[PDB]
């Protein structure tokens, strides 16, 4: 906001600085403006060729001079004439020995959501982005280095992938790569990583640049044979399944926050790779990891069904006291064979909860949080068991609910069941997290109204609202229509009740059907229309988690290795498809 | 998986075997490779004409030699040059006396979902499938037999129907059939069955090859007269209603597992045939078979309403014992006129259940299973009645529910009601069989939580959860909101209950609306959009069942017989339509 305010004022400052100097005004159609610009910059800016030539005759040092602002730092007139595509000025600027290697470190050039363009820092990178082949053919003739890297580390190959017109990005990727012609450099330009470690092939995957993914994939395709309609294609599979030493391209797509990246999961070498590694080793481990967790939660349940309880030593403290049984002490808890059989299962439970923490906590989405909370609630149950602290029903009840709802995590192994878990998340963190603020406020209004209406009345007849916390809970239950409307029929209720509850009943049906239409638009189109895409993104997330947390003996590398077939040491995936 | 692994390794083995031999490498641009191939095979594979000619000059025995692998067994170079459509090589191979009758018995050629192509075994069958008319015009000139049959028994007529480009399949069907020119053979080529017994006309129906159904139907159309816009067309109806000796084409479409086959039910001779036989004899028997079954289930109900019961001889065994009446013994069950009137209806019931087993069990979808289970539960009721075994309420209650829900089978006679039964099946074996795994797991988590919260409390106030099987059943009922939320208001419930039940109530509404949107997508588009198609497939299934299980006197053959009209002994169906 404040920065956007300053840019505009600096841009309005610049228009004043042009008007003050008649020479700078003449350039518009040694003094410097608000942006640090010169007359050569302004003539290049508005494509004033004749003003630029007359100024460069007087000052030929003006060509070398960069803008001095923070917004346009390092920018020379050559940058301006390049993006404005004035060919004859670019020729004239190079004739006056313009630097083709100048770096524009200005904030307006840096990759940021505030800036609409990201063109890099070098005139090659500016020229390729504005799609001028000739200037690229002209700048390299004057010593411009294609291997130039930015503050982000991007070369021009990386920058073209980050451009909104993906078709022009393809041709300029072709042109600059054809101009390398070096074998002496340890990395060719397609193989040069940026500072994040992403190659141009990896960058197209992370950004969801689909056509740049496809063009780069043709370099990694070898066609073995063609049998009429059939053809056999062998895929390099080096970067899309790099594992054991570095993050995979599949791993980068999952961790990135771009929904466009997940379309790359539907591209051909990626798709059969994921489906193969899922069917080969992905499913039978995950269903085995599912069955072990299910027997664990059943073992945790039985220890909670048979928890140590004794008749209460105390007398009843009120007529409203319903307690009959209390927790045993520690020595009382274990003195019999049934207590020893439970002690085995409770020890299995705690050892299971410790193993959960070991495979989860030293590592650091939602099912991460649910199982860590479940393992945490188990340890609190043991701690209270050891010190004989009362209230163990509170950690267990969290753990029974959290422990069983983790069993729903293993629905994603089945193809139909997995997007149903997607529905549950989007309904609760979308439509529920929105509408609960409208919904609780109606509950607070009517529960307060319902409380004071029965505040004079006797609670024995109608105790829905006997104190204010129960009046909140009852009105919540009346909202969802899970308990009946309060009625006695043997006594006179207040007349203000019948008006309020009829007003409540209309709003509660109206608001609850509104939550249904909101959850209608969610699960129908966002999830059930895209069930195959969402389930595939679940597999890649599940498998990458499996690969990190499993030994090498269990997980063989996917594809077929060369050097027994003379292809390299790389792991190749063969796909046979029908071209018809 | 493992077989797909082996094929790729064998394909990568083959690329090594080419590189080792310089002669085999020269063929790529007497030794044999991994696939058993030769240099002539590899030259034919990559369309290397000049390498093939030089090799066949040296070895002319190489033309005769087949590949020796399991994957490509029996394949010669003539097969390879045919599918690759190298005309000049095919001419050159025939000039060296190539076998046109060689059979490729390899696993890659066999019809299987692992193999993308099914081309048959003979070079005629390969040439027609890759759509080369000239090679077919050339191979027959060298002695190729069109009547060749595979291990599946398919001739080239059958194979063309099994091809994904149905338009090219039509022309090659025309070309090969025009080349038969034999009357001496007992079956012409359109009439030659495969090993399954299917002709090319029957095969197009079973596979749902609609345009091959239409082209073959024109041969079975005779146009009687044309009256301006009106025309009268007479259909052969021989194979689409073969009955009394063999399965019909209608019967093949029902029993097959292809959804594409049911579009053939909407083709013109099929459609009016089904609608005619349904209206003529299909409905009035089925509604008669419906009314007889309805009076049977009403008779079974009245025998269960009036089942023999006496006051209990024992005393009450607990304060929680609600039993007042018990079953009579066998001699007590029948000693009065009302007992004799029930004995008639019970004998009608058992004789009815035996007749169900006779018309169902010696024969061996869902309503098959439901009525056999109903007839089985009836016989258990009699067995327990005879030996005075207690617990007869268990077989009856299964039989009352199963017996009445069979009456829903007769909804398909009515056109609107039939797809509603489709909805019930798809919702229960789709959306229910999926979502019950997510839904029971939430129930198990909260019922366990609800149990231990009230494990200390006294059950007399709140006995929803007094033991663990009732806590499961109550939480199931709270999930569907068919019983009210537990509340006392005269006693203090645990505070962990109000948190857990509010957590339960949100999830239970959220998950239950999710089941509604899932059942929304089911019944709307899968069934109600396709209600006429689903109801028509119900008729064909019902009628074919009727034809098997009814005497000849009740079911006359459809159409109009010739030989009283001089058309043959075949049964013809006349359809008058408006061509406008
Ligand atoms: C939600 C769950 C937490 C809120 C519950 C309030 C805490 C509480 O115990 O309420 C207590 C205070 O009652 C109040 O006066 C405070 C409530 C005022 C509005 C609540 C703001 C919450 C909105 C964001 C209710 O006390 P009581 O015993 O039910 O009745 C009052 C005592 N009396 C009988 C003397 C009148
Ligand atoms: C579904 C329907 C079948 C399951 C019912 C279990 C069988 C059963 O009778 O439960 C019994 C065992 O209770 C248990 O401890 C076993 C239940 C543990 C989890 C169930 C796994 C099912 C998931 C797939 C309940 O016994 P109870 O009498 O309800 O209470 C325990 C006795 N006590 C009072 C001494 C503590
Ligand atoms: C007494 C001992 C031998 C019992 C064995 C304990 C297991 C029942 C637990 C221990 C650690 C495991 C778990 C821990 C880590 C994973 C991650 C997993 O899901 C996520 O959190 C993924 C993130 C997301 O998708 O939201 C939860 C279960 C899983 C496979 C495991 C399931 C069950 C395991 C084998
Ligand atoms: C004893 C009571 C008070 C415990 C409180 C209940 C809630 C805190 C928990 C338990 C049941 C729910 C969970 C149950 C299952 C879902 C699935 C959901 O789905 C996904 O992760 C799909 C995306 C993916 O990871 O692939 C994530 C958490 C969620 C809403 C829940 C998180 C929180 C909930 C509301
Ligand atoms: C969407 C809406 C507009 C539906 C239209 C129906 C309501 C406008 C009517 C239905 C019958 C109700 C009435 C029925 C009876 C009650 C009792 C009330 O006075 C009493 O008798 C209270 C009893 C007592 O004092 O003991 C006055 C009107 C009231 C709330 C109601 C006013 C309005 C209600 C909701
Ligand atoms: C004492 C006697 C004379 C009473 C007569 C007994 C009938 C009530 C039963 C005997 C066998 C019959 C049935 C047995 C065979 C059929 C199959 C039918 O449905 C299927 O199973 C088709 C498969 C499917 O679509 O799922 C169910 C009832 C029906 C017509 C019959 C309905 C009723 C019938 C006439
Ligand atoms: C006493 C209690 C414990 C009996 C248990 C009830 C269920 C086992 C049964 C009885 C009612 C249901 C049936 C009722 C009717 C339907 C129609 C459905 O319809 C079709 O077959 C349409 C397809 C076709 O055949 O054309 C098949 C079975 C189904 C879901 C049900 C099969 C199973 C259900 C759940
Ligand atoms: C979709 C959701 C987020 C809608 C928003 C409403 C809930 C957040 C509020 C509504 C009023 C409820 C509260 C109302 C009163 C209860 C009683 C409880 O303590 C008691 O008084 C128990 C009684 C006893 O100990 O005898 C503490 C909070 C609780 C569960 C509630 C906490 C949260 C609830 C569900
Ligand atoms: Mg949402
Ligand atoms: Mg009620
Ligand atoms: Mg379904």
Numbering used by the authors:
A (entry chain B), B (entry chain C): 27 to 55, 73 to 407, 423 to 638
Wording from the paper:
Member 6 of the vanilloid family of transient receptor potential channels, TRPV6, is a master regulator of organismal Ca2+ homeostasis. TRPV6 acts as the major dietary calcium uptake channel in the human gut3, and as such, this channel remains constitutively active, while its activity is regulated positively by membrane lipids such as phosphatidylinositol 4,5-bisphosphate (PIP2)4–6 and negatively by Mg2+ ions. It consists of four subunits and features a transmembrane domain (TMD) that houses the central ion channel pore, along with an intracellular skirt primarily composed of ankyrin repeat domains interconnected by three-stranded β-sheets, N-terminal helices, and C-terminal hooks. The TMD includes six transmembrane helices (S1–S6) and a re-entrant pore loop (P-loop) between S5 and S6.
